[PDB]
Design an enzyme around this catalytic site. Structure first.
Site, PDB file in Angstrom:
ATOM      1  N   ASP A  36       3.713  19.073  -8.175  1.00  0.00           N
ATOM      2  CA  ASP A  36       5.108  19.142  -8.567  1.00  0.00           C
ATOM      3  C   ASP A  36       5.470  20.523  -9.697  1.00  0.00           C
ATOM      4  OD1 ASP A  36       8.049  16.905  -9.971  1.00  0.00           O
ATOM      5  OD2 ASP A  36       7.777  19.047  -8.623  1.00  0.00           O
ATOM      6  N   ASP A  65       6.210  10.180  -4.061  1.00  0.00           N
ATOM      7  CA  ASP A  65       5.307   9.748  -5.649  1.00  0.00           C
ATOM      8  C   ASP A  65       6.285   9.062  -6.288  1.00  0.00           C
ATOM      9  OD1 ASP A  65       6.788  12.410  -6.354  1.00  0.00           O
ATOM     10  OD2 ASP A  65       6.747  11.196  -7.694  1.00  0.00           O
ATOM     11  N   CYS A 104      -2.569  -9.280   0.095  1.00  0.00           N
ATOM     12  CA  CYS A 104      -3.305  -8.485   0.303  1.00  0.00           C
ATOM     13  C   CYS A 104      -5.164  -8.453   0.134  1.00  0.00           C
ATOM     14  CB  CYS A 104      -3.099  -7.732  -1.935  1.00  0.00           C
ATOM     15  SG  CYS A 104      -4.050  -6.114  -2.278  1.00  0.00           S
ATOM     16  N   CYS A 138      -8.010  -8.185  -5.300  1.00  0.00           N
ATOM     17  CA  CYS A 138      -7.494  -9.638  -4.872  1.00  0.00           C
ATOM     18  C   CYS A 138      -9.113 -10.296  -3.640  1.00  0.00           C
ATOM     19  CB  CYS A 138      -6.598  -9.173  -3.865  1.00  0.00           C
ATOM     20  SG  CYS A 138      -4.724  -9.286  -5.166  1.00  0.00           S
ATOM     21  N   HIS A 193      -5.438  -2.846  -7.356  1.00  0.00           N
ATOM     22  CA  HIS A 193      -4.167  -3.464  -6.376  1.00  0.00           C
ATOM     23  C   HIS A 193      -2.628  -3.277  -6.659  1.00  0.00           C
ATOM     24  CE1 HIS A 193      -1.785  -6.493  -4.668  1.00  0.00           C
ATOM     25  NE2 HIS A 193      -0.784  -6.733  -5.939  1.00  0.00           N
TER      26      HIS A 193
HETATM   27  N1  LIG Z   1      13.550  12.016  -8.946  1.00  0.00           N
HETATM   28  C1  LIG Z   1      13.903  13.385  -9.474  1.00  0.00           C
HETATM   29  C2  LIG Z   1      12.648  14.082  -9.432  1.00  0.00           C
HETATM   30  C3  LIG Z   1      11.131  13.804  -9.356  1.00  0.00           C
HETATM   31  N2  LIG Z   1      10.559  14.839  -9.749  1.00  0.00           N
HETATM   32  C4  LIG Z   1      10.883  15.708  -9.560  1.00  0.00           C
HETATM   33  N3  LIG Z   1      10.797  16.959  -9.314  1.00  0.00           N
HETATM   34  C5  LIG Z   1      11.445  18.576  -9.084  1.00  0.00           C
HETATM   35  N4  LIG Z   1      10.309  18.842  -9.019  1.00  0.00           N
HETATM   36  N5  LIG Z   1      12.297  18.322  -8.682  1.00  0.00           N
HETATM   37  C6  LIG Z   1      13.250  16.522  -8.718  1.00  0.00           C
HETATM   38  O1  LIG Z   1      14.414  16.513  -8.932  1.00  0.00           O
HETATM   39  C7  LIG Z   1      12.409  15.145  -9.348  1.00  0.00           C
HETATM   40 ZN   LIG Z   2      -4.541  -6.519  -4.555  1.00  0.00          ZN
END
Ligand SMILES: NCc1c[nH]c2nc(N)[nH]c(=O)c12
Ligand SMILES: [Zn+2]
Ligand SMILES: NCc1c[nH]c2nc(N)[nH]c(=O)c12
Ligand SMILES: [Zn+2]
Lengths: 364, 364
Positions: A92, A261, A299, A304, A330
């Site tokens: 990110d 994610d 699972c 599990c 898990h």
């Molecule tokens: N749930 C919104 C969100 C999660 N992670 C994020 N990372 C960035 N850069 N911008 C975003 O708007 C979001």
């Molecule tokens: Zn499991």
């Protein structure tokens, strides 16, 4: 290997399944990315993360830039070598965590205490050796005034261009990694449209839907996805950031999302919550004290296969690390199995039935 | 398979190496037993414990009898199935932890708040399905008055007989498990002699040296081992409870000890201390921030094959579970490699040189 090649193998409605080929591996879509906060998917060796079926993990610019530091990780060979994950990593940009975890916003960027700008974000992601680089954005708080939403989004669109240019001007990065743009616009269809427009104009390898899961319940998240994902380029992946529960994921895939994610499987795992096909359970509950069944009856994960609810109950109540380990393994496995089921069902053109069947059982 | 068959393959001085064959596996001696407190070797899956080379682990009667409870574990199939370790387990009797962790002592036993008697200890170890059962003893606090030491030991010798009889009267237990007696006597040669005498008279499968590592420095522990281990039956294993650092282990093997348990590798691992052939290091130290070498340059463990000091430094400083995991795996592996080196060197009649070489480097 390809830098970034997205192929859609099959569609059903708005849902798609396929593959993103990258230099460090193939990502099967729809994809769930375990989150690896400070250069670790919490409580899991990368080999275990892989064993669960993850094709890619998420790293945080914000956290790593503070600890241990981007130059330091680059000096140590990059994030992949540092943490021992040799497959794709999406980082990110820091846009979200700088505001949520730290702050002064300006056109140039954000200065904080725990200057992060588009350029510096890109650079840091470069130093980390990220495979999928996120543009530096502003995750508009929810709720927000339309004018507020609009200038917030417009700044992120300016920051998206800056991110694009910073990325492109780093040849190694441009040749080996991918860049995703992040759509903002809050809950406003026109602003979302505007934002998709700006992003598509700039051009990215993938398009995230930012600013959701930040106060909007599921109904509202889905309503926003209903109009927002169709505004993104069809031929590029669609990434819903920070989402979510299994049912969030299924409904978002029904709306065209290809990537996800979330910290839920890891964090709630450490906290005693196990995901099962019959819904989440809190393994700390006394009802599990003598339950010899696995966390989930269907699972396929290693946990599990070997350990009972009763044992994991004991571990978590005792605050034992192994408890966090097994719960996390898990839950990430479960999420991966969900994604596989999603992929297979779209492939087979029975995703709608799957979603229906999933939901019936999960909420029952 | 044999219930309990101890074979000495090779000797050097007072040191011995060989094997204890049990129904659930072979124990190579000298043996180090990782301690598994509340039905887990902290931060390690049993498969990882095994991978490090452990042949047997230690379980705690005291802890398990409180949480999750002995009847409950028996109901769940016994400790082996519960925690997923199918190899031998030695259970301590509770004698030490009831006093250290809880108390009113009497002839019948000890009553506490967090009645534990020899019989109840044996029974609980039975319910747990322990392979090596420890007699219920009293770990005489150190230091102590000779008269104090003597009546304390004499009670433990009475409790040793009671333990023997309780064990013997449980046919399943008697046929499938082993019983070890624990020598007490503090630092007093005559009381130690007395105690060995009583134990040998009663007769056990193995003999522990209790009441050490409880205030006595190494010099004093070794002085007590110098006269105490020769009083034990030669043809039975000699177990030094709660010991210790690598150098403690080497010196104790030079004095005739065959078995060891200690929380050090696991606990100090979680705390940042890594054992290396050049001595312990505290991985949190800033000097390791950019150290790309493994924890130990020679170690064969999986951690050292894949991750750097720098990474583990980061994890431990971040309070990351994986840090505890990798530190623990390495430290237990290190201990196991130490034991292997000890076994091989006695086998080869070069243990004295090894001890010397070990010590030179470890303390340098
Ligand atoms: N749930 C919104 C969100 C999660 N992670 C994020 N990372 C960035 N850069 N911008 C975003 O708007 C979001
Ligand atoms: Zn499991
Ligand atoms: N270090 C002494 C010691 C460790 N564990 C022990 N367990 C028992 N039952 N008795 C003991 O004396 C000891
Ligand atoms: Zn190692």
């Amino acid at each position: 290997r390809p830098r970034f090649s997205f192929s859609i193998a099959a569609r059903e409605g708005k849902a798609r399944t396929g593959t993103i080929e990258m230099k460090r591996g193939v990502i099967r879509t729809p994809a769930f990315m375990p989150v690896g906060t400070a250069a670790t998917v919490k409580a899991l060796k990368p080999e275990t993360v892989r064993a669960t079926g993850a094709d890619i993990i998420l790293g945080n610019t914000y956290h790593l830039m503070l600890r241990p530091g981007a130059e330091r990780i680059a000096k140590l060979g990059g994030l992949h070598s540092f943490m021992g994950w040799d497959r794709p990593i999406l980082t990110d940009s820091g846009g979200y965590q700088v505001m949520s975890l730290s702050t002064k916003q300006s056109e140039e960027g954000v200065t904080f205490k725990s200057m992060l700008s588009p350029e510096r974000s890109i650079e840091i992601q470069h130093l980390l050796g990220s495979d999928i680089v996120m543009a530096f954005d502003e995750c508009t708080p929810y709720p927000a005034t339309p004018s507020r939403a609009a200038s917030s989004m417009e700044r992120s669109m300016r920051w998206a261009k800056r991110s694009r240019d910073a990325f492109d001007s780093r040849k190694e990065q441009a040749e080996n990694a991918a860049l995703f743009g992040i759509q903002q616009g809050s809950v406003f269809e026109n602003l979302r449209q505007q934002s998709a427009d700006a992003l598509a104009e700039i051009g990215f390898d993938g398009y995230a839907v930012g600013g959701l899961a930040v106060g909007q319940g599921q109904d509202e998240m889905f309503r926003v996805l209903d109009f927002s994902v169709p505004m993104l380029p069809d031929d590029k992946p669609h990434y819903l950031m920070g989402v979510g529960k299994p049912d969030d994921i299924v409904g978002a895939v029904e709306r065209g999302i290809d990537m996800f994610d979330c910290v839920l499987p890891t964090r709630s795992g450490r906290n005693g919550q196990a995901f099962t096909w019959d819904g989440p359970i809190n393994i700390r509950n006394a009802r599990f004290s003598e339950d010899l069944k696995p966390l989930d009856s269907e699972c396929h994960c290693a946990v599990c296969q070997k350990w009972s609810r009763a044992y994991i109950h004991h571990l978590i109540r005792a605050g034992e690390i192994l408890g966090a380990m097994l719960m996390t393994e898990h839950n990430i496995a479960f999420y991966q199995q969900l994604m596989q089921k999603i992929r297979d069902s779209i492939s087979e053109g029975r995703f709608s039935q799957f979603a229906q069947d999933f939901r019936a059982r999960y909420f029952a």
